Enzyme design. Structure first.
Site, PDB file in Angstrom:
ATOM      1  CG  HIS B 363       5.757  -3.721   5.504  1.00 60.00           C
ATOM      2  ND1 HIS B 363       6.695  -4.413   6.132  1.00 60.00           N
ATOM      3  CD2 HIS B 363       4.633  -3.705   6.280  1.00 60.00           C
ATOM      4  CE1 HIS B 363       6.193  -4.845   7.253  1.00 60.00           C
ATOM      5  NE2 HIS B 363       4.957  -4.409   7.337  1.00 60.00           N
ATOM      6  CE  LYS B 666      -4.760   5.004   9.648  1.00 57.95           C
ATOM      7  NZ  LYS B 666      -3.712   5.940   9.364  1.00 57.95           N
TER       8      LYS B 666
HETATM    9  C1  LIG Z   1      -2.430   5.524   9.300  1.00 58.53           C
HETATM   10  C2  LIG Z   1      -1.386   6.539   9.497  1.00 58.53           C
HETATM   11  C3  LIG Z   1      -0.356   6.675   8.599  1.00 58.53           C
HETATM   12  C4  LIG Z   1      -0.231   5.777   7.472  1.00 58.53           C
HETATM   13  O1  LIG Z   1       0.273   6.444   6.323  1.00 58.53           O
HETATM   14  P1  LIG Z   1      -0.238   5.933   4.896  1.00 58.53           P
HETATM   15  O2  LIG Z   1       0.073   6.963   3.888  1.00 58.53           O
HETATM   16  O3  LIG Z   1      -1.670   5.881   5.105  1.00 58.53           O
HETATM   17  O4  LIG Z   1       0.343   4.605   4.632  1.00 58.53           O
HETATM   18  C5  LIG Z   1       0.550   7.687   8.757  1.00 58.53           C
HETATM   19  N1  LIG Z   1       0.435   8.554   9.815  1.00 58.53           N
HETATM   20  C6  LIG Z   1      -0.585   8.410  10.712  1.00 58.53           C
HETATM   21  C7  LIG Z   1      -0.743   9.406  11.789  1.00 58.53           C
HETATM   22  C8  LIG Z   1      -1.477   7.387  10.569  1.00 58.53           C
HETATM   23  O5  LIG Z   1      -2.473   7.203  11.475  1.00 58.53           O
END
Ligand SMILES: *Cc1c(COP(=O)(O)O)cnc(C)c1O
Ligand SMILES: Nc1ncnc2c1ncn2[C@@H]1O[C@H](COP(=O)(O)O)[C@@H](O)[C@H]1O
Ligand SMILES: Nc1ncnc2c1ncn2[C@@H]1O[C@H](COP(=O)(O)O)[C@@H](O)[C@H]1O
Ligand SMILES: *Cc1c(COP(=O)(O)O)cnc(C)c1O
Lengths: 823, 823
Positions: B363, B666
């Site tokens: 990653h 999301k």
């Molecule tokens: C999904 C999620 C992330 C992921 O961060 P990205 O910027 O989307 O990669 C970070 N914090 C929470 C609470 C999450 O659920």
């Protein structure tokens, strides 16, 4: 909402319900199942399955105390020497049987499981044992009562005997959790150490202190068949855990590693001298406890029920702080520190409360044993309290100056502050100055306290001094350990005896009924039979289950005279070897005790007892006529096992050295006869029992004092006696040693040149008593008849009688044996 | 024995049964009462009532994997960002309605209690959110998977914003128990440290190593209504407690109170350089884990299926491990040490198995961020291990040489041992060589691996380098977090989407059905509606419900660019002020995310955002046309409130940097238009949804390399764009920081003279794409049809797709949404 009630949950006396809650607690609470579980896992589930029952009857009682709002008495003690809980819970809680049938069906043996139970490692001697018994009685006579103490993680070490030498191992009893306690994260309290007492405005402020967090645990204790379960709250030392950045006392130097560990070991180590831990621990238990105390004082109906301040005019009427021995003593400075600095009370009132609320129980016969902190420690770590202690000192000494004016020495004898190189504060004078009743533990003890150790306090306040003779609980030490005999008492006299022990006296019309005689002698037969069997299953020996079972299961110390009994065992050895065809009543003499770490003598004494051992138990001529076993790692578990199988009870302490003693009594309820000095509680047993029924030997205390006065000269004994002359030359040459001969040197020389405890004085009469004892052992129907006259007489030694007395005479609440309704 | 079953103990979807269970656990598990219970307390009554069910099916599933003995998978990740369990479990077991009703009939409201749970702080960002999803997808696909990490006691920090500055408080989420977990003291393991390798006769032995204990904690993981429940097993490090007298190292010196706390703080905190503790935390999580992994290979029936050596030949058929990022690489030479040294294989039969077991998800793109430990640092605490890495190294470089002969320079680049001042071991290159699969987590990413970073590993091992694009579970991130949108998508097409996400293309029909379009827009009016309110209730601001809810939730890090977003908000601010009466669409900009301590730029951007907030939210000319809010302590439960409410997801990093980005997704599923650059997982969203349903802007990776090629010179953008020049001069004069003019000196200067990420460069294009965003918000029927098109297309982003691709192209097992039997 009122549908969130207790109501719904318990099917009690039904086996099918129990199999169901056991299976629930195995699978759901334990998160185990049968292809992976263990004896311990079905042991946990059963205890958890027993505990449901238990915390239901606890909610209802706790509830009840808040409704009917009574005097709460708080039993402070730093050791709570409970030991195994299961069956004890099942017997006071009546599920005893309902559980056995359910475990047989599920297909587990209750005994296989009950022995997985480790003794609750909060204890050591007849201090914390007593505490645990008292608590049973507090519940059975229905007092709203709390016992508080510290939750130690490591108990007092487990004994390993390796090569006749004691090794200390550790009791990490809570290794796998403890199914009975309930942790309270919600109720964590801060306790403070160190500081600076800044004097400002209306008083003074204890500033800049280190804090530790006391988190309580709640262990319930169930009254005998009376549906009250009370609590035992103990406290765990917890560090605040900013320790990594916050406060920014770290980052730079994380040596706060220490703050946290020195914290964490407040609760780790139990104690078997002047170590700052001991003081941190005593204080810890006291400070936390008094905050939970005043917290319920305000909360129960009273945060409401104020009139002025929710004034502590009725704090005496609703709280009772029982100081069991000077270990709780910072409770009098810490209640005046809480009432005078945080509440805004003033001295004379705040004192009226301390004193009216507080009571002290002394357990030591000789002045040296009593606690005294060096004043600089208190000044460094508990400042506020050393001011208060000195104000208290000032004032009590103006009371004695008022009473006996012009005397200089009384002021200087009674002072809380001892002068000398290393200035001290005498905690027993704190407790006497600050308590409204002081008391002993056996008739003679409380009288030397009144007449020698505290008599300057005695004649200032004769009113204070009471006596409250120790006792035993008929639950643990009869019904439980010895059912066989509890049973043949049941049919003769009823069941009321276990909640009322003076009824045993009814057995005294059946002295002569040969039917009861054989029953009584049958039970003991079954008991020694069983012990000979655990003794050769868990460990092994070539016992004679028929022999006179002699036991001395005392703390191993010089004033407790194990050597007086070893000299006597080598006396019978030396006779059975000198005349091999003479009838000698066979004995198997067992001695148990854990030494005390590095007490040179005591460790050497255990090695002597396993010496006689390897010698006589292996000699061909001796046969089975005589045998000596040292009982490994004596404990509540183990007394429940050997106290039943004892015929003779070895209470042989130097006249005037035991303040009371309680295994004494235990042994009397189990039908065993005592050979003991006229000392401790042996006095009140013999007095209840009839001296004709008791084996009293040895010098009365008069005879001791006098021999000190004319000079104890050991030697003179040695020289007018041949078996004693002999046995000491035996030890010496290396009779009992021979791979290092010269090894028992220090015992041969201590005994002989410098025994402070007078072993040789009592040797002529001790064997001339031990003979009488062996003659009546060799008479069946009257041995059993001396015994019953003891058993019937046991009553006054039930701890229920000791708590009724505390209740009415020191505390001020009637008792009650009325069975609560509920669940 | 068969009599001890999981069987009688339930009623499942049954109000009256669950209300009965709730009353037991409140009064018997919690030993609390209605007269005493908190809100905190009624959630442990409820969470315990919901846990019974959650574990009965765990009982069943695990027996079910021992009997079925399926190949097993183990996700090794040092971070599982679980976060709130009551509802996911209620909705994965379908008891939400029945519970809501029970607690409702009891008279508590279920929503109240839901918010008392503190998020299970075992994670931190991307990496660890991901893992948590993969567990819900892997359970749902009925796969026999496992989650193994450290149980952090203090997680990572909770964010407090004080004075518009970031304060990090500690997360002791473990404060009153975590009911979802089960402590297993009894499977504690030795994890070994330091020591020396003594090479004896047949091998080497790793002697003289400090030991630390690894205690496990079990948390059941419920798949979606398919009756499976797997396990996340996290390990708590713990000191040996021999530290007192037992060992004869202490007594005389307990300075190893240190060993004790250096050992406990392996489990104490998340991280957050070459630090001895990071490597300690890595080795620790691996090793206690590889003994459970190998143990189950022996004990899970396979002890009776040995055939030969209980062969580790059948090990890659029946076990599979995943290195989720280089944080478990020591699993590879930790395994070669267990097979060769502890078992007894030769090094090829040991390596065959290891390279056939390990598959490692990647990653990271930038070289600079691949894991690299100093070899001296591996010598001191893992000496055997760095011996085994060097073996691996010799041979892997001899393979490489068999293959690219003549090339020395390739040999000196592909090796696991990097040279410079301080030689290091390329934990990246260890991971690749000891694996049968490497895979990026988004197509643009996996290819840059093969192309630029991992390239000489692909010429040599082409087949190995796959990809498996990231994805999100639909259960947490649409059903649980969006019951409203869950409801209307059910209306038009029913459940299989929840368990099968590309099934959402069916929604493309409804694109112009006016019912649908009123209902998607209505659900969002109401999600925003409640979030305006917590933005008043639990913290404070006056939100206008009717505004473009513009959100940006990222790691506050320079390249993620909330300074591009700060500049557009100052530019609306200025606009709305030069012309107070022009219709500009009202917006609520919201930025949240943690800094990560000591990053000064980040800590200054958190203040910048709050400085701007204070100015615009108090400017009267502005009204509610514009408000800038910093969301505080962004974590998994905020993400589930803020995402339903977002209308614009700002996914704006510099073109080329984000490797994928789980939150991108999301938002899409939750109907929000994405503004963002062409990079990461924007790339496969603007492909799934069709580009014109996306607000793609800025420089493409192409023209960033190009900009570096002729050299980015910030000042020229400064010298043409006239609103930029204006905001730079506002920043510097202290328009936003009036008491300290010079406070943003660093940010300004940064931008202007050494911005590694080309913020100014994407400034004209970004303000214009946002102009087009407020334009399309000014027309509800088309913005809603875009939204319908972005939701209709979410399917390519389920974690159920990603996990499938894992099971079939790497781990070799088959997914199954088939119901397992149970209760
Ligand atoms: C999904 C999620 C992330 C992921 O961060 P990205 O910027 O989307 O990669 C970070 N914090 C929470 C609470 C999450 O659920
Ligand atoms: N105000 C109250 N009214 C009734 N019962 C109470 C009250 N406060 C405490 N209790 C009871 O005492 C228990 C707590 O004991 P304590 O630790 O003394 O507060 C509760 O669970 C109830 O059983
Ligand atoms: N041999 C077995 N037979 C049946 N079920 C088992 C067996 N071993 C383990 N289990 C189940 O798997 C769970 C987890 O096992 P473990 O891997 O030992 O943690 C246990 O709690 C049981 O539910
Ligand atoms: C009863 C008992 C004691 C009490 O000691 P005494 O000297 O008899 O008062 C000590 N330890 C155990 C295990 C006991 O059962």
């Amino acid at each position: 909402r009122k549908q969130i009630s207790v109501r719904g949950l318990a099917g009690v006396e039904n086996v099918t319900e129990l199999k169901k809650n056991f299976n629930r607690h195995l699978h759901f609470t334990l998160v185990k199942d049968r292809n992976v579980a263990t004896p311990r896992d079905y042991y946990f589930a059963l205890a958890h399955t027993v505990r449901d029952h238990l915390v239901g009857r606890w909610i209802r009682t706790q509830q009840h105390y808040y409704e009917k709002d009574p005097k709460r008495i708080y039993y402070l003690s730093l050791e709570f020497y409970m030991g195994r809980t299961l069956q004890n819970t099942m017997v006071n809680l009546a599920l005893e049987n309902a559980c056995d049938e359910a475990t047989y069906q599920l297909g587990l043996d209750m005994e296989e499981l009950e022995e997985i139970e480790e003794d609750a490692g909060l204890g050591n001697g007849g201090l914390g044992r007593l505490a645990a018994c008292f608590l049973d009685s507090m519940a059975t006579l229905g007092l709203a009562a709390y016992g508080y103490g510290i939750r130690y993680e490591f108990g007092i070490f487990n004994q390993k005997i390796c090569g006749g030498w004691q090794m200390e191992e550790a009791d990490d009893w809570l290794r796998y959790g403890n199914p009975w306690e309930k942790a309270r994260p919600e109720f964590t309290l801060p306790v403070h150490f160190y500081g600076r007492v800044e004097h400002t405005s209306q008083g003074a402020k204890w500033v800049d202190t280190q804090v530790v967090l006391a988190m309580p645990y709640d262990t319930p204790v169930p009254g005998y068949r009376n549906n009250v379960v009370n609590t035992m709250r103990l406290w765990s030392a917890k560090a605040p855990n900013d320790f990594n950045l916050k406060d920014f006392n770290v980052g730079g130097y994380i040596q706060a590693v220490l703050d946290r560990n020195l914290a964490e070991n407040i609760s780790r180590v139990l104690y078997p001298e002047g170590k700052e831990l001991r003081l941190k621990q005593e204080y810890f238990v006291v400070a936390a406890t008094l905050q939970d105390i005043i917290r319920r004082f305000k909360s129960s109906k009273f945060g409401c029920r104020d009139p002025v301040r929710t004034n502590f005019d009725a704090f005496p009427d609703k709280v009772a702080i029982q100081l069991n021995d000077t270990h709780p003593s910072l409770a009098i400075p810490e209640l005046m520190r809480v009432l005078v600095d945080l509440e805004r009370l003033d001295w004379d009132k705040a004192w009226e409360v301390t004193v009216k609320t507080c009571a002290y129980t002394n357990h030591t016969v000789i002045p040296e044993a009593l606690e005294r902190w060096p004043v600089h420690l208190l000044e460094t770590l508990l400042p506020r309290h050393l001011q208060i202690i000195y104000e208290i000192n000032q004032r009590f000494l103006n009371r004695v100056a008022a009473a006996f004016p012009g005397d200089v020495d009384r002021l200087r004898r009674m002072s809380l502050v001892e002068e000398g190189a290393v200035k001290r504060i005498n905690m027993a004078h704190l407790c006497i100055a600050g308590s409204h009743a002081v008391n002993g533990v056996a008739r003679i003890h409380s009288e030397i306290l009144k007449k020698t150790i505290f008599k300057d306090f005695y004649e200032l306040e004769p009113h204070k001094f009471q006596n409250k003779t120790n006792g035993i609980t008929p639950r643990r030490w009869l019904v439980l350990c010895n059912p066989g005999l509890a049973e043949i008492i049941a049919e003769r006299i009823g069941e009321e005896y276990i909640s009322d022990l003076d009824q045993l006296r009814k057995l005294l019309s059946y002295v002569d009924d040969e039917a009861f005689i054989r029953d009584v002698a049958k039970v003991k037969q079954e008991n020694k039979l069983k012990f000979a069997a655990y003794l050769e299953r868990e460990y092994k020996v070539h016992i004679n289950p028929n022999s006179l079972f002699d036991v001395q299961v005392k703390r191993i110390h010089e004033y407790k005279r194990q050597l007086l009994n070893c000299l006597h065992v080598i006396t019978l050895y030396n006779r059975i070897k000198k005349e091999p065809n003479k009838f000698v009543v066979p004995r198997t003499v067992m001695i148990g005790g854990k030494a005390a770490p590095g007490y040179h003598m005591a460790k050497m004494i255990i090695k002597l007892i396993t010496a006689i051992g390897d010698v006589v138990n292996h000699d061909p001529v001796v046969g089975d006529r005589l045998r000596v076993i040292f009982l490994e790692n004596y404990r509540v578990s183990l007394a429940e096992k050997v106290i039943p199988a004892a015929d003779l009870s070895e209470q042989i302490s130097t006249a005037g050295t035991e303040a009371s003693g309680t295994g004494n009594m235990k042994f009397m309820l189990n039908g065993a006869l005592t050979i003991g000095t006229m000392d401790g509680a042996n006095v009140e047993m013999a007095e209840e029992a009839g001296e004709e029924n008791f084996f009293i030997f040895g010098m009365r205390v008069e005879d001791v004092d006098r021999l000190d006065q004319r000079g104890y000269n050991a030697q003179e004994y040695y020289d007018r006696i041949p078996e004693l002359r002999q046995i000491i030359e035996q030890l010496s040459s290396g009779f009992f040693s021979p791979k290092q001969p010269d090894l028992f040197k220090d015992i041969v020389n201590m005994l002989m040149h410098h025994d402070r405890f007078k072993v040789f004085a009592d040797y002529e009469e001790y064997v001339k008593c031990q003979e009488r004892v062996s003659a009546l052992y060799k008479n069946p129907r009257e041995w059993t008849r001396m015994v019953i006259r003891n058993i019937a007489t046991s009553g006054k030694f039930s701890s229920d009688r000791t708590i009724a007395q505390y209740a009415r005479e020191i505390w001020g609440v009637e008792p009650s044996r009325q069975r609560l309704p509920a669940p």
